[PDB]
Every structure is written in C-alpha cells, then in structure tokens.
Amino acid sequence: NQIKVQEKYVWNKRESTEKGSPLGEVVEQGITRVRNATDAVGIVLKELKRQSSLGMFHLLVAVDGINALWGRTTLKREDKSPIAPEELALVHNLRKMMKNDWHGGAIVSALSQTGSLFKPRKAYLPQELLGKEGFDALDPFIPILVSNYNPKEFESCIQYYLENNWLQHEKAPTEEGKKELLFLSNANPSLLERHCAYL
Amino acid sequence: WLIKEELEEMLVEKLSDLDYMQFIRLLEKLLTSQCGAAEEEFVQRFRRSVTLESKKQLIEPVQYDEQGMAFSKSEGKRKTAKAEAIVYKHGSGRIKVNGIDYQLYFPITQDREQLMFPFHFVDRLGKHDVTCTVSGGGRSAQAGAIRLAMAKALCSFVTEDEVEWMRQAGLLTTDPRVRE
Numbered sequence A: 001n002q003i004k005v006q007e008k009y010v011w012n013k014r015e016s017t018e019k020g021s022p023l024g025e026v027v028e029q030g031i032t033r034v035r036n037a038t039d040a041v042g043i044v045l046k047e048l049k050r051q052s053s054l055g056m057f058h059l060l061v062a063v064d065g066i067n068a069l070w071g072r073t074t075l076k077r078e079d080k081s082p083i084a085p086e087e088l089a090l091v092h093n094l095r096k097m098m099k100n101d102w103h104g105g106a107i108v109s110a111l112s113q114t115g116s117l118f119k120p121r122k123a124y125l126p127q128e129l130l131g132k133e134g135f136d137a138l139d140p141f142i143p144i145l146v147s148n149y150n151p152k153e154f155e156s157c158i159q160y161y162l163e164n165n166w167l168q169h170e171k172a173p174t175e176e177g178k179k180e181l182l183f184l185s186n187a188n189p190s191l192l193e194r195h196c197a198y199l
Numbered sequence B: 001w002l003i004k005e006e007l008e009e010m011l012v013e014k015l016s017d018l019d020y021m022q023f024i025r026l027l028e029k030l031l032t033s034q035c036g037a038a039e040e041e042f043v044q045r046f047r048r049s050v051t052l053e054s055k056k057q058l059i060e061p062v063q064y065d066e067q068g069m070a071f072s073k074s075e076g077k078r079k080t081a082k083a084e085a086i087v088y089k090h091g092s093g094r095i096k097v098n099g100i101d102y103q104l105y106f107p108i109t110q111d112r113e114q115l116m117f118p119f120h121f122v123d124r125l126g127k128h129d130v131t132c133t134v135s136g137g138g139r140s141a142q143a144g145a146i147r148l149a150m151a152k153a154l155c156s157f158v159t160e161d162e163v164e165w166m167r168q169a170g171l172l173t174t175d176p177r178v179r180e
C-alpha cells in the first residue's frame, strides 16, 4: 500500500492501472487473472528497481539457483524446437535485477547444481555453473564459500538432534556412533541430516 | 612320517601296508626312547618336512615421503576394478579417490560403509590419511578393491594380533568370485 506506481499500466482495453495507485493492485491483478501474471511480475520488478533508487525503501534481491538464468532450458515450442532462457519474459525481466545499475540495496545469490540443466554432478564452482555468459553478467561480484561442518559445527548439529530426541538408535549417543556418522557424512550437512533421518 | 610308496622307492622293493605300519611303529618306539645324535639322524632319514604351514599375512614395508611422513602402499583387486592405496601413518581421516573426496566419488552409502569397514574394525577412524587410485570395474567393484588395498596398507601400522583379526574378518583376502 505504501509503494505507489509511477506509470499507467494497461492490462486490457477495459482495464488499466492508473498512475499513483498502490503496487498491491498490480500484484492483485496478477493473482486474479493469470493471463496477466507474468506481465505483473515484470512491472513489480521495474517499480522495485526504480523506487529503491529514489530511496523509498531498501531492496534485497535474493535469488537461489541463480545459474539457471544464463544457461539452457528444457522447454520446447510446438514444432519441437528449443527455447532459450532469454526468450522467457520471466527470466528476461529477472536478469535486469542482477545488473548493478541501481543503488539502495544488495543482491544476494546462491548457486545450485541440484535441479540444474546440463551440468555434471560435481560442478560447483562459479564459472562452471554460471557459464561464460553468467560469469560475465555477474562480474564484478563477491563469491562466498560454504563448506562442510567443522568439528564444532558437527558436534553442535548432533547435539541439536539429540536434544530433539531425533536420534533413536541406542548407539547414536555414544562416541563410536558419532565417529561413524562423521565418517559416513564427512561432515556434509545434507548427508548427515539424511542419515539421521532414518536412525 | 615317510609315505609307503616313497619308502618303497628308497628300499627299491614292494612292501605291504602291515609291514609299513610295523616299521613306523618301531621308529616311533625308537623316538620314545632317549635317542642319541646318530639315532636322531637315522630317524630324520625317514622324516619329511611337509607338515604345517602358517598364514601370517606378509606386511608391507614403511616408506617415507619427501616431507618426512611415513606411509605404506598396497594393491587390491575386485572383479575388473584394480586399486592402489597409500595409507599415511598420521592423518585426520581424509580419503582421496582419484584426487576426489570419497563422499563425492562414492555417492552411494554402501560404498562409504565398505571404505569405513577396515578402519572401524581396528578403531582408528580419523587417524589416517588415504590417497588411492582405482581403475576399471564399476561402483561396487571399485569400493571393494579400495577396501582391500586400504586394509593391506593399514596392516603396517597395527599389531600382529590386529593383523590376524583383520585376516579372520575377511579384510585381507582377495575375493576371487568373477563372471563365467
């Protein structure tokens, strides 16, 4: 309600959003008629980039699995031809928010090989997952490394699970159980959690 | 004791089973008495050395790398997979397979349990570093070959009792089962 549009957006000959109307109306128009959902996302982004620059609010752009934007798709036309990521309006509007042509906020992103397309299982570094196009788009950027649990972190995770009574096997509380869990996960958070799920 | 047909070969005369038993009984009676050096040699003329064989698991020697660390190398084979492991005396439990971490190289938990088996069996998880190289075969064959190579290399840093326990646990025997 506080944020108000700055242009007349014409959904259809019968319907338009007038200048100065709250952004919520735009959002509402996307939720009621799905035909205008994709055009409603873009408008939102266009407004959020612009007003943030004026200083009306601070904007955080948090995109998980960002390596999708400059990659490939598995979407096809009716003639069985491939579709490029930039041919999608939703993907094309979200790339504009990764460019650092605005102030009043920060862009935080996380890579992910899980759910990626046309990437080997062991690819995790920025360039391998992003591609030349993605690395060129994000460059300059600050890469932050996430690693496996260190011993303090690993012990704390198992103590949290023990406090929740989530480790039901009688040997899990013991030292030998913790050493075997450490070896079998190698302090990897996801493997450790999956192993503890059925213990 | 000398077998009947070898006794025949030396005596160059065919002899029956009962007379062979009689001769062996006389030799036993001679042994029971306080046989001197000459008599001991005479019985040794009839004594063959075949009996008994000890399975002791030849240990690999300890090598030293340029940094001064002690390590031992060993080889293993399972189906068409062939592995060579280098086990260091001191480490933090880091296993590297073809230059890759073991949990990344072995997604399936069964293979990781197989790699855990040797070190857990002797209660030295988190005390050695392993650098192995495996080629051929598939997922399970590679895991088994690495298990064998690591056990054989680890035998250098355990007591002989622990070596024998590993042998009796099946950790030091090459699995010969292969396709027709």
Ligand SMILES: Nc1nc2c(ncn2[C@@H]2O[C@H](COP(=O)(O)OP(=O)(O)O)[C@@H](O)[C@H]2O)c(=O)[nH]1
Binding pocket: A008, A009, A010, A011, A036, A038, A039, A040, A041, A042, A043, A044, A046, A089, A093
């Ligand atoms: N239905 C409708 N959608 C609009 C309108 N204006 C912007 N949009 C959508 O909001 C997005 C804003 O992107 P924009 O800044 O205009 O870049 P552009 O694609 O080159 O025009 C567009 O991609 C459209 O999908 C409008 O006046 N009517």
